[PDB]
């Protein structure tokens, strides 16, 4: 089977910035890819639509996925599936966590190589189209992650 592709339409204080799409590496991390895919379509009855990027650190990453801390599709938190894929550069999609085996819905998009996270955060996808949109988002962050405008996922879903 072809790896899934999903998309986010990004808005800044309600004004459209464009569409970002992601390849999900289901061939290496099937359970982790399936969680993000289903949260993007809304098929379990909840997910990423309407949520914000709450933590943005320029030169590092954009983090989102906490909706009313977030939750996985497998009921609160699931195990680290593997560490096959590494944090190799801009556009890498990886799971946020609060220690071992604490994956939920929160995720981050890298804007640099973040090798110090290897073996602790599960990498599961990469930006395919719209990397410049992620770079534009990054400009609304700060040292501590606070955003100066409301950066939201206005819409989301599956393309393949
Ligand atoms: C670049 C990645 O940096 C972090 O992951 C920092 N930790 C973090 O935000 N922890 C909060 C959190 C709570 C519950 C779940 N499920 C996931 C995350």
- Using an 8 Å Cβ cutoff, are 92 and 63 in contact? no
Task: Please give the distance, rounded to the nearest whole angstrom, from the Cα atom of residue 106 to the centre of ligand 1.
Answer: 7
Strand order in the sheet with 107-110: 53-57, 61-64, 107-110, 92-95, 123-129, 15-24, 5-12, 151-158
* Catalytic residue status for 39: no
Ordered structural domains, the chain, with CATH: 1-160 (2.40.100.10)
- Using an 8 Å Cβ cutoff, are 6 and 129 in contact? no
User: Which experimental method was this entry solved with?
Assistant: X-ray
The binding-site residues of ligand 1, defined as CB within 6 angstroms of any ligand atom, are: 61, 63, 69, 77, 96-98, 102, 104, 106, 108
Q: Is 155 exposed, middle or buried (0-12, 13-18, 19+ CB in 10 A)?
A: middle
What resolution in Å is listed for this PDB structure? 1.2
Q: What does the alpha-carbon distance between residue 159 and residue 156 come to, in Å, rounded to a whole number?
A: 10
Q: In sequence order, what are the beta bridge partners of 18? A: 10
Residue with tokens 């819905």: 105
User: Which of 108, 122, 134 is closest to 21 using CA atoms?
Assistant: 134
The atom number, within ligand 1, closest to the CA of 77 reads: 16
Q: Which of 3, 19, 54, 60 is catalytic?
A: 60
Q: How many CA atoms lie within 13 A of 73 on its CB side?
A: 18
- Using an 8 Å Cβ cutoff, are 54 and 147 in contact? yes
CA 32 remoteness from chain centre: 11
Q: What is the 3-state secondary structure (H, E, C) of the chain?
A: CCCCEEEEEEEECCEEEEEEEEEECCCCCHHHHHHHHHHHHCCCCCCCCCCEEEEEECCCEEEECCCCCCCCCCCCCECCCCCCCCCCCCCEEEECCCCCCCECCCEEEECCCCHHHCCCCCEEEEEEECHHHHHHHHCCCCCCCCCCCCEEEEEEEECC
User: Which of 98, 83, 70, 68 is closest to 32 using CA atoms?
Assistant: 83
Alpha-carbon Rg of the chain, whole angstroms?
A: 14
Best mutation site among 57, 98, 124 for ligand 1 pocket (most ligand atoms within 8 Å of CB) = 98
Residues 6+ apart with CB under 8 A from 42: 48, 49, 156, 157
């Amino acid at each position: 089977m072809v790896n899934p592709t999903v998309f986010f339409d990004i808005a800044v204080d309600g004004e459209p910035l464009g569409r970002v799409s992601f390849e999900l590496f289901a061939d290496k991390v099937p359970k982790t890819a399936e969680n993000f895919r289903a949260l993007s379509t809304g098929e379990k009855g909840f997910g990423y639509k309407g949520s914000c990027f709450h933590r943005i650190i320029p030169g590092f990453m954009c983090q989102g996925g906490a909706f009313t801390g977030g939750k996985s599709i497998y009921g609160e938190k699931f195990e680290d599936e593997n560490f096959i894929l590494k944090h190799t550069g801009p556009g890498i999609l990886s799971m946020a966590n609060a220690g071992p085996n604490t994956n939920g819905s929160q995720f981050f998009i890298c804007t640099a190589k973040t090798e110090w996270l290897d073996g602790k955060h599960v990498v599961f996808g990469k930006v395919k189209e719209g990397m410049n949109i992620v770079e534009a988002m990054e400009r609304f962050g700060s040292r501590n992650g606070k955003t100066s405008k409301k950066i939201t996922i206005a819409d989301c879903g599956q393309l393949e």
